[PDB]
Amino acid sequence: LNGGITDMLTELANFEKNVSQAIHKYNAYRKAASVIAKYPHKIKSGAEAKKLPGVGTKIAEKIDEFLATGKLRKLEKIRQDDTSSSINFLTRVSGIGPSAARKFVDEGIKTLEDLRKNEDKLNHHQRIGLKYFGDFEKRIPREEMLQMQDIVLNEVKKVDSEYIATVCGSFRRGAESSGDMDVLLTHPSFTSESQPKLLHQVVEQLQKVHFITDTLSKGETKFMGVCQLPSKDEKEYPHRRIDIRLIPKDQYYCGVLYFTGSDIFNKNMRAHALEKGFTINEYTIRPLGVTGVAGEPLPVDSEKDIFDYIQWKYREPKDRSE
DNA sequence: CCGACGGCGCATCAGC
DNA sequence: GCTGATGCGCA
DNA sequence: GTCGG
Ligand SMILES: [Mn+2]
Ligand SMILES: [Mn+2]
Ligand code: NA
Ligand code: NA
């Protein structure tokens, strides 16, 4: 339908984030691309698009120019600018953000080949992103996600049967592919009110069976690293990004709910929670008073509990597109 | 006309 | 060595 | 850049 337009808006988004370092305009363009992508008609003018929430005056003007000419002047200028195109490109490596990409380009480091020649100028995270540049841009098919889930759940329970692990993200909504693997971890001994190395023991075991191959960051509640499925002669599996988050048990199911999404679903759930006198964040659900003052967090034993408080019928994850 | 727009865990740095 | 700021990635 | 207050 309008792929030409949504591509243009995505490019602009990427330029605003990576080159202009203007994060709010980045999100404005993404939001416009999202709503347009869902519009069930071929857009004929800026005016028509302007009717959509998130599309404003300036975007409507760009849509008119693109419809008239098949291009944006602004974008063509950005494309044949060497500095902008290289800065934008370098941010594709994990650990290189707008600030580093700009620093590198300023000193004439503009390609993966230039990065490889200057590994001495990269921090640890950046060296890993460079090393697995191609693998990290590959999506993960559902069948491998399930194989990964199996290994994680298994090795987790092998450390302590009391651990609870949940793989969240679009995967839990039954997506046929995932960008990375996001695991939420909890344990009885870990509560809001009060063990020292709970997460470490899980990372250790997954390293032990050679599932986890590299670490980007690690602390007491959050691990970000790299993993790989095992191979038997045949093709080695691509390395994948995995995060593991250790969450206190009394906030675990609020966590699962949050990190399951989708983002659109969370928005309309918070929105309905409010109309019913409740406020839901990533951590707790809490009741509101007449002046809008949140009380103590309510006890939560499962996602359903949360749907009960706000008198909402339980939505199975697969129906949480919104 | 105006400021909001997600907020946080971890790595690294800047200033001292 | 200390602390707080910044960069980064990610629901 | 777009929005609601
Ligand atoms: Mn303003
Ligand atoms: Mn307005
Ligand atoms: Na609009
Ligand atoms: Na990056």
Side-chain angles (χ1 to χ4, degrees), chain A residues 18-192 194 196-231 235-302:
Chain A
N18 298 326
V19 181
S20 302
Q21 307 191 26
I23 191 66
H24 305 301
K25 300 168 161 218
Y26 160 81
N27 286 309
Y29 284 116
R30 277 195 88 181
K31 173 185 189 190
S34 292
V35 69
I36 286 161
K38 291 181 177 90
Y39 189 70
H41 301 286
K42 183 178 179 180
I43 290 167
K44 298 191 185 83
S45 62
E48 179 182 354
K50 198 169 180 308
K51 297 210 260 283
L52 309 175
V55 178
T57 294
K58 317 257 262 323
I59 288 172
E61 294 174 357
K62 291 169 165 67
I63 290 171
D64 286 331
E65 159 172 14
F66 179 82
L67 284 181
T69 71
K71 73 179 177 180
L72 274 195
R73 283 139 144 71
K74 180 191 225 308
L75 241 25
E76 292 241 283
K77 192 140 309 303
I78 289 166
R79 284 185 198 106
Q80 35 219 47
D81 187 49
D82 174 56
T83 290
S84 288
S85 60
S86 309
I87 296 189
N88 192 60
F89 171 72
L90 285 186
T91 63
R92 282 165 67 181
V93 175
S94 182
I96 299 189
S99 174
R102 154 115 35 211
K103 187 187 217 211
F104 287 133
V105 174
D106 283 338
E107 65 191 336
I109 293 175
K110 307 163 177 176
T111 62
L112 298 190
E113 315 86 56
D114 296 321
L115 291 180
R116 288 173 191 126
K117 288 165 35 169
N118 295 272
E119 295 241 8
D120 66 305
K121 291 170 181 281
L122 278 48
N123 65 33
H124 181 67
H125 183 143
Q126 288 161 350
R127 296 185 167 119
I128 301 294
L130 176 56
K131 183 182 180 197
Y132 305 113
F133 184 78
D135 286 352
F136 292 176
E137 283 190 346
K138 284 182 188 194
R139 287 200 65 95
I140 314 187
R142 180 166 200 85
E143 200 71 25
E144 292 179 26
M145 281 304 291
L146 293 155
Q147 303 176 51
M148 286 153 85
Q149 175 184 53
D150 284 348
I151 291 146
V152 165
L153 297 185
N154 190 68
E155 300 303 326
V156 155
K157 88 152 100 147
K158 199 190 295 189
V159 179
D160 187 331
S161 55
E162 285 152 320
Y163 277 121
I164 311 187
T166 302
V167 182
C168 306
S170 64
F171 167 75
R172 192 163 173 266
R173 315 204 294 285
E176 287 298 328
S177 73
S178 301
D180 58 19
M181 161 163 276
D182 194 15
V183 191
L184 275 62
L185 189 70
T186 191
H187 186 267
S189 64
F190 185 37
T191 91
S192 271
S194 82
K197 298 274 177 219
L198 286 185
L199 181 46
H200 177 97
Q201 291 186 318
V202 164
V203 169
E204 264 197 341
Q205 179 68 20
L206 294 174
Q207 286 169 326
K208 196 173 109 128
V209 303
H210 304 113
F211 181 69
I212 280 174
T213 57
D214 310 86
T215 295
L216 295 171
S217 58
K218 166 174 173 293
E220 299 181 303
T221 53
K222 185 173 209 164
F223 169 94
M224 293 168 56
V226 175
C227 63
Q228 177 180 41
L229 283 176
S231 70
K235 206 85 160 269
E236 208 189 356
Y237 281 102
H239 292 66
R240 313 289 195 183
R241 283 273 298 110
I242 178 166
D243 297 338
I244 313 160
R245 303 163 168 273
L246 178 73
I247 301 176
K249 170 69 164 186
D250 51 289
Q251 303 179 349
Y252 182 76
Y253 295 102
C254 280
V256 168
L257 180 67
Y258 184 72
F259 292 109
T260 283
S262 59
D263 289 7
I264 305 272
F265 172 79
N266 294 340
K267 190 276 158 193
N268 307 345
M269 184 160 180
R270 285 185 246 267
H272 185 274
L274 294 192
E275 85 158 277
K276 300 247 102 135
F278 292 90
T279 176
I280 299 177
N281 63 26
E282 146 185 3
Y283 307 107
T284 55
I285 172 161
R286 308 187 291 147
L288 305 149
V290 319
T291 41
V293 172
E296 283 270 88
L298 299 158
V300 167
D301 310 314
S302 57

